[PDB]
Design a protein around this nucleic acid. Structure first.
Ligand SMILES: [Mg+2]
Ligand SMILES: [Mg+2]
Ligand SMILES: [Mg+2]
Ligand SMILES: [Mg+2]
Ligand SMILES: [Mg+2]
Ligand SMILES: [Mg+2]
Ligand SMILES: [Mg+2]
Ligand SMILES: [Mg+2]
Ligand SMILES: [Mg+2]
Ligand SMILES: [Mg+2]
Ligand SMILES: [Mg+2]
Ligand SMILES: [Mg+2]
Ligand SMILES: [Mg+2]
Ligand SMILES: [Mg+2]
Ligand SMILES: [Mg+2]
Ligand SMILES: [Mg+2]
Ligand SMILES: [Mg+2]
Ligand SMILES: [Mg+2]
Ligand SMILES: [Mg+2]
Ligand SMILES: [Mg+2]
Ligand SMILES: [Mg+2]
Ligand SMILES: [Mg+2]
Ligand SMILES: [Mg+2]
Ligand SMILES: [Mg+2]
Ligand SMILES: [Mg+2]
Ligand SMILES: [Mg+2]
Ligand SMILES: [Mg+2]
Ligand SMILES: [Mg+2]
Ligand SMILES: [Mg+2]
Ligand SMILES: [Mg+2]
Ligand SMILES: [Mg+2]
Ligand SMILES: [Mg+2]
Ligand SMILES: [Mg+2]
Ligand SMILES: [Mg+2]
Ligand SMILES: [Mg+2]
Ligand SMILES: [Mg+2]
Ligand SMILES: [Mg+2]
Ligand SMILES: [Mg+2]
Ligand SMILES: [Mg+2]
Ligand SMILES: [Mg+2]
Ligand SMILES: [Mg+2]
Ligand SMILES: [Mg+2]
Ligand SMILES: [Mg+2]
Ligand SMILES: [Mg+2]
Ligand SMILES: [Mg+2]
Ligand SMILES: [Mg+2]
Ligand SMILES: [Mg+2]
Ligand SMILES: [Mg+2]
Ligand SMILES: [Mg+2]
Ligand SMILES: [Mg+2]
Ligand SMILES: [Mg+2]
Ligand SMILES: [Mg+2]
Ligand SMILES: [Mg+2]
Ligand SMILES: [Mg+2]
Ligand SMILES: [Mg+2]
Ligand SMILES: [Mg+2]
Ligand SMILES: [Mg+2]
Ligand SMILES: [Mg+2]
Ligand SMILES: [Mg+2]
Ligand SMILES: [Mg+2]
Ligand SMILES: [Mg+2]
Ligand SMILES: [Mg+2]
Ligand SMILES: [Mg+2]
Ligand SMILES: [Mg+2]
Ligand SMILES: [Mg+2]
Ligand SMILES: [Mg+2]
Ligand SMILES: [Mg+2]
Ligand SMILES: [Mg+2]
Ligand SMILES: [Mg+2]
Ligand SMILES: [Mg+2]
Ligand SMILES: [Mg+2]
Ligand SMILES: [Mg+2]
Ligand SMILES: [Mg+2]
Ligand SMILES: [Mg+2]
Ligand SMILES: [Mg+2]
Ligand SMILES: [Mg+2]
Ligand SMILES: [Mg+2]
Ligand SMILES: [Mg+2]
Ligand SMILES: [Mg+2]
Ligand SMILES: [Mg+2]
Ligand SMILES: [Mg+2]
Ligand SMILES: [Mg+2]
Ligand SMILES: [Mg+2]
Ligand SMILES: [Mg+2]
Ligand SMILES: [Mg+2]
Ligand SMILES: [Mg+2]
Ligand SMILES: [Mg+2]
Ligand SMILES: [Mg+2]
Ligand SMILES: [Mg+2]
Ligand SMILES: [Mg+2]
Ligand SMILES: [Mg+2]
Ligand SMILES: [Mg+2]
Ligand SMILES: [Mg+2]
Ligand SMILES: [Mg+2]
Ligand SMILES: [Mg+2]
Ligand SMILES: [Mg+2]
Ligand SMILES: [Mg+2]
Ligand SMILES: [Mg+2]
Ligand SMILES: [Mg+2]
Ligand SMILES: [Mg+2]
Ligand SMILES: [Mg+2]
Ligand SMILES: [Mg+2]
Ligand SMILES: [Mg+2]
Ligand SMILES: [Mg+2]
Ligand SMILES: [Mg+2]
Ligand SMILES: [Mg+2]
Ligand SMILES: [Mg+2]
Ligand SMILES: [Mg+2]
Ligand SMILES: [Mg+2]
Ligand SMILES: [Mg+2]
Ligand SMILES: [Mg+2]
Ligand SMILES: [Mg+2]
Ligand SMILES: [Mg+2]
Ligand SMILES: [Mg+2]
Ligand SMILES: [Mg+2]
Ligand SMILES: [Mg+2]
Ligand SMILES: [Mg+2]
Ligand SMILES: [Mg+2]
Ligand SMILES: [Mg+2]
Ligand SMILES: [Mg+2]
Ligand SMILES: [Zn+2]
Lengths: 37, 13, 140, 204, 174
RNA sequence: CGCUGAAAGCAUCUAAGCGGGAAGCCCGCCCCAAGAUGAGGCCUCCCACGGCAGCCGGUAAGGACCCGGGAAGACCA
RNA sequence: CGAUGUCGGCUCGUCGCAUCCUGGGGCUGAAGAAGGUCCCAAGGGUUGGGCUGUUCGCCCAUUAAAGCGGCACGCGAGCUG
RNA sequence: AAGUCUGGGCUAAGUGGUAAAGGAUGUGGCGCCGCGAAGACAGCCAGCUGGUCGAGUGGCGCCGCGCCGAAAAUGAUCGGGGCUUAAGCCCAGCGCCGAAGCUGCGGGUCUGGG
């Protein structure tokens, strides 16, 4: 998981989700998994 | 770290 | 002419069902009753407020996320002696303290305010041991 | 949970499987139950035990009454065991078989006014190289203006011992029912002749 | 473009009682209570159940589709019922039943024994296939997930407990 | 990290709801503790005294003083 | 400035967490073992020596690890000097 | 001490009650394009076109209020308790409380005019 202040879509298959008051970025490619923080 | 004393060692009355 | 000052009178006992009521908004009213500021002969330096009995204190109600976010605090005087206890758990373990702590913080500080707190009888569950005094039911 | 009152009698070692095993001998039995605490009446569960028999010439009238209501001869010591309710009217050593682990409570030996080195294992001060009358002293006890005070619980000299101590999970090496004797492996708080309490262990 | 307003076919014969805050769906395989928002209105028509919402605002639109699917899943559960299958890939790896319980042999120093909760039945056809069956869809999905967790699919080898029809993605190894 | 699941016909651990998950947190262990003035509880004992919520007089159950001491202790306890 | 004693050591701690170890994780250019990097976590632990007044640092032998800071660069009505 | 006052609206973070670049399908409200009953978007059935589905769907910008970014040392806290169609924020009102300011009443001095 990447933890950044700038969470972004990295590829077209990336999906910006928001769960529990935190912006995540989930995706098929595990490298693209992001959480804002 | 070593700094200069600001008071002398106390002398007898 | 000088302002009327009341001689000692019999205090009124009062019953209140806390079930479903908002913690702070009930607490305010209980404090007012305790201070006796509903009585037209109110006097600041004597205990002439009511005795307030409260039941179903475990069924007090709270808005927002305060069940898990409201934190009660206690310092022991020792290093690291700060205990933090959430609403949820306070209710689980000593539910009457929730309403007690609220009312206590809304009473004056000092010898008198401490006496007024003593006239607050709070109970979890719908029963109270004060049949003898036969407290007047109040709708607030 | 089960337990018995007893006096610590002394220490030895016995031999078992070509091993020397240090023991403390304990005179435990016999303890008559003199009162029972019930959830209906007392709000909890335990048994008041009596130990050692007492010269009735010394038993005052309120005490006399208490014993009489239990049909029990005067006893020297009254003590409860929590969450324990024996079927019989008498608790003896036989409630323990060899191999069980137990917890022993006593009153530790008293060191009186104890220095900070004995009490708390402080290092004290140097014994040469200029040390000035502070060989067994505690050193600093705080900071400066912040916080400008001393913590509650600050380890300092003071009384030490003569206090309740429970050592836990001791092996019962043997029991000698005909002499009301327990043989526990290792050390037990307090002096010889001191009153101890032997409870079934809480360790798993 | 909508779920909540799409009606729910109710097979002959399952009953759908409506109470405030819940619906009761009885059927040939058992009963199930569906907790439902007081703000939503369930409707019992001939061989069909519908769910209607009050306003068209955010919370209500969201509760809508949810409620309809929740009830539709209860219906299918008591009629057809639900099931998930697990595939067990890897040489040493095998499963078997011991009474009602499931016994996993998946390369540990011990075997893992999974007990079936109430309303859940285990089946082992081949010793490399497991069927989790029940009327509660979330419970079947859960227990299934539980079982898979015991020995998740490897990342480098076709090995471990797999979902039926779950793709085998692997990474190269040195 | 999930199960179920809309808004958003797909998808989504979440917006309803439910799991799993730390030497950490709450309890559990040990010790103190009702001056907890919110001063708790149980068992047992004495008891209805004489004189004009007070005063005085002698008692009851008990307690203290004093003494012999103590792996208790500076004195006190 | 009609005085707030000043480095280092010793003694005694206590707090912070931007975590050295231990526990729990995600990603890995993660085969396994072992690492890297980030996240959670302050409960406990965080060795003995050679040199120098040294803090620091280098070095020896180990270690799960040999953490970094605040407390008047914590602590001289506590000691050293 | 005096309104749990009235009416419209927003916010769900205890934001209010301590901060920036920047990041985000937070929420509500505007605006502008693209595609679509000649059948679009999503799913199922093929090769950016076709088949049933029968509606909307995708994108850009702006405004209000919120989210992250947000680690420090003795015990915490918006002054406290406590507050969620508010006891928060924006807009519009009515009333009250409130000082040794102003008024009423009495008095003293100095100054000016009688
Ligand atoms: Mg990162
Ligand atoms: Mg970038
Ligand atoms: Mg892109
Ligand atoms: Mg989404
Ligand atoms: Mg969570
Ligand atoms: Mg995805
Ligand atoms: Mg210098
Ligand atoms: Mg309310
Ligand atoms: Mg109320
Ligand atoms: Mg009132
Ligand atoms: Mg409510
Ligand atoms: Mg809550
Ligand atoms: Mg402290
Ligand atoms: Mg502590
Ligand atoms: Mg702290
Ligand atoms: Mg004040
Ligand atoms: Mg109890
Ligand atoms: Mg029991
Ligand atoms: Mg000595
Ligand atoms: Mg000594
Ligand atoms: Mg010691
Ligand atoms: Mg030393
Ligand atoms: Mg030393
Ligand atoms: Mg020494
Ligand atoms: Mg000297
Ligand atoms: Mg000297
Ligand atoms: Mg000397
Ligand atoms: Mg000292
Ligand atoms: Mg000093
Ligand atoms: Mg201070
Ligand atoms: Mg003592
Ligand atoms: Mg052992
Ligand atoms: Mg004892
Ligand atoms: Mg509808
Ligand atoms: Mg679906
Ligand atoms: Mg390769
Ligand atoms: Mg998944
Ligand atoms: Mg799913
Ligand atoms: Mg939820
Ligand atoms: Mg919400
Ligand atoms: Mg959970
Ligand atoms: Mg799981
Ligand atoms: Mg451990
Ligand atoms: Mg006690
Ligand atoms: Mg005790
Ligand atoms: Mg008492
Ligand atoms: Mg006690
Ligand atoms: Mg008492
Ligand atoms: Mg009790
Ligand atoms: Mg008589
Ligand atoms: Mg008499
Ligand atoms: Mg008389
Ligand atoms: Mg006498
Ligand atoms: Mg002694
Ligand atoms: Mg003596
Ligand atoms: Mg004496
Ligand atoms: Mg000066
Ligand atoms: Mg001076
Ligand atoms: Mg001075
Ligand atoms: Mg100075
Ligand atoms: Mg000074
Ligand atoms: Mg020293
Ligand atoms: Mg030294
Ligand atoms: Mg030394
Ligand atoms: Mg500190
Ligand atoms: Mg330090
Ligand atoms: Mg951290
Ligand atoms: Mg860092
Ligand atoms: Mg290091
Ligand atoms: Mg680790
Ligand atoms: Mg770690
Ligand atoms: Mg790790
Ligand atoms: Mg490698
Ligand atoms: Mg892995
Ligand atoms: Mg390799
Ligand atoms: Mg990095
Ligand atoms: Mg890692
Ligand atoms: Mg690093
Ligand atoms: Mg970093
Ligand atoms: Mg720690
Ligand atoms: Mg700490
Ligand atoms: Mg530390
Ligand atoms: Mg060294
Ligand atoms: Mg050296
Ligand atoms: Mg040498
Ligand atoms: Mg040297
Ligand atoms: Mg050095
Ligand atoms: Mg350095
Ligand atoms: Mg150097
Ligand atoms: Mg290691
Ligand atoms: Mg070193
Ligand atoms: Mg170092
Ligand atoms: Mg270092
Ligand atoms: Mg730092
Ligand atoms: Mg340090
Ligand atoms: Mg410092
Ligand atoms: Mg400094
Ligand atoms: Mg320093
Ligand atoms: Mg210093
Ligand atoms: Mg330092
Ligand atoms: Mg330091
Ligand atoms: Mg100093
Ligand atoms: Mg000096
Ligand atoms: Mg010095
Ligand atoms: Mg000083
Ligand atoms: Mg209002
Ligand atoms: Mg937030
Ligand atoms: Mg706040
Ligand atoms: Mg804030
Ligand atoms: Mg900004
Ligand atoms: Mg916006
Ligand atoms: Mg299509
Ligand atoms: Mg925050
Ligand atoms: Mg801070
Ligand atoms: Mg600071
Ligand atoms: Mg104010
Ligand atoms: Mg309004
Ligand atoms: Mg004036
Ligand atoms: Mg005038
Ligand atoms: Mg004139
Ligand atoms: Zn991606």
């Amino acid at each position: 998981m990447k933890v950044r202040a700038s969470v972004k879509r990295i590829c077209d298959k990336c999906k910006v989700i928001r769960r529990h008051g935190r912006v995540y970025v989930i995706c098929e490619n595990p490298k693209h998994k992001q959480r804002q923080g | 770290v070593d700094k200069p004393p600001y008071l002398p060692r106390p002398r007898p009355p | 002419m000088k302002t009327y000052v009341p001689k000692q009178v019999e205090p009124r006992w009062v019953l209140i069902d806390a079930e479903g009521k908002t913690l702070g908004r009930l607490a305010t009213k209980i404090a007012t009753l305790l201070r006796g500021k509903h009585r037209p002969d109110w006097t600041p330096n004597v205990a002439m407020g009511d005795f307030v009995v409260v039941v179903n204190a475990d069924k007090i109600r709270v808005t927002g996320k305060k069940l898990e976010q409201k934190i009660y605090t206690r310092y022991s005087g020792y290093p690291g002696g700060l205990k933090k206890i959430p609403l949820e758990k306070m209710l689980a373990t000593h539910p009457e303290r929730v309403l007690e702590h609220a009312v206590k913080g809304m009473l004056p500080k000092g010898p008198l305010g401490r006496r007024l707190f003593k006239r607050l009888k709070v109970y979890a569950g719908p029963d109270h041991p004060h049949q003898a005094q036969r407290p007047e039911k109040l709708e607030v | 949970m089960k337990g018995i009152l007893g006096v610590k009698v002394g220490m030895t070692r016995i031999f078992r499987d070509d091993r020397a095993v240090p023991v403390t001998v304990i005179l435990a039995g016999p303890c008559p139950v003199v009162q029972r605490r019930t959830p209906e009446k007392d709000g909890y569960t335990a048994v008041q035990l009596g130990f050692l028999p007492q010269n009735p010439k010394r038993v005052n009238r309120p005490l006399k009454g208490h014993f009489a209501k239990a049909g029990v001869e005067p006893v020297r010591i009254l003590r409860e065991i929590r969450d324990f309710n024996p079927e019989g009217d008498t608790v003896t050593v036989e409630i323990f078989k060899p191999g069980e682990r137990v917890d022993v409570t006593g009153t530790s030996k008293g060191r009186g006014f104890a220095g900070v080195m004995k009490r708390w294992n402080f290092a004290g001060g140097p014994d040469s190289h200029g040390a000035h009358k502070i060989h067994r002293h505690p050193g600093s006890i705080g900071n400066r203006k912040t916080p400008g005070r001393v913590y509650k619980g600050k380890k300092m000299a003071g009384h030490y011992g003569a206090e309740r101590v429970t050592v836990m999970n001791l092996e019962v090496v043997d029991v000698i029912p005909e002499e009301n004797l327990l043989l526990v492996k290792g050390a037990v708080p307090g002096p010889n002749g001191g009153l101890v309490i032997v409870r079934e262990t809480k360790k798993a | 473009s909508r779920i909540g307003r799409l009606p729910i076919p109710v097979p002959k014969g399952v009953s759908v009682e409506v109470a405030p805050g819940r619906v009761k769906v009885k059927g040939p395989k058992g009963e199930l209570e569906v907790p439902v928002s007081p703000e939503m209105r369930v409707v019992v028509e001939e061989g069909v159940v519908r769910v209607e919402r009050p306003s068209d605002e955010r919370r209500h639109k969201s509760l809508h589709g949810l409620t309809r699917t929740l009830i539709a899943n209860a219906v299918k559960g008591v009629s057809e019922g639900y099931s998930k299958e697990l595939l067990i890939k890897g040489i040493g790896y095998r499963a078997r039943l011991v009474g009602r319980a499931l016994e996993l042999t998946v390369g540990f120093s011990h075997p893992v024994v999974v007990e079936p909760p109430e309303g859940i039945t285990f089946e082992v056809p081949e010793p490399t296939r497991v069927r989790v069956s029940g009327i509660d869809k979330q419970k079947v999905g859960q227990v299934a997930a539980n079982i898979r967790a015991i020995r998740k699919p490897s990342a480098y080898h076709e090995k471990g407990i797999y979902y039926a029809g779950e793709p085998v993605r692997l990474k190269p190894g040195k």
